[PDB]
Amino acid sequence: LEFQHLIENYGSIAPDALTVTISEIAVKDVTDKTGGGVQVTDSTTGRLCML
Amino acid sequence: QIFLKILPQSGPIGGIKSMGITTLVQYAVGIMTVTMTFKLGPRKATGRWN
Numbered sequence: 001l002e003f004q005h006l007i008e009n010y011g012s013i014a015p016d017a018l019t020v021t022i023s024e025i026a027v028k029d030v031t032d033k034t035g036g037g038v039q040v041t042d043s044t045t046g047r048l049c050m051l
Numbered sequence: 052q053i054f055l056k057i058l059p060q061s062g063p064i065g066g067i068k069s070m071g072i073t074t075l076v077q078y079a080v081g082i083m084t085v086t087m088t089f090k091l092g093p094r095k096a097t098g099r100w101n
Contacts (some may be wrong), residue, residue: 001099 022050055079 006013027046033039062073 001097001101005097 022048 025048027043027048029041029043029046030038031041057077057079060075060077062075063070064072
């Protein structure tokens, strides 16, 4: 819909600015579940490297 | 309503014989210019995906 609106209403387009936000990071530990399989828990010491 | 007509003009009366009463053959032309303003509402915002 928004692309239709763009091409219906405007004569030209150019890129101007970009923002990337990484949020709600969860580094999740995995361990064996009771009765088999795995279960997941949120880690307070796990770190996501962002460069 | 705008009403228009040509004002009738009398033909000659006087020393000329047999004239009777006549009107001048006249017609009118011009330019009618009509300006109308319309109020326009904005389009409603669209939530659709498609």
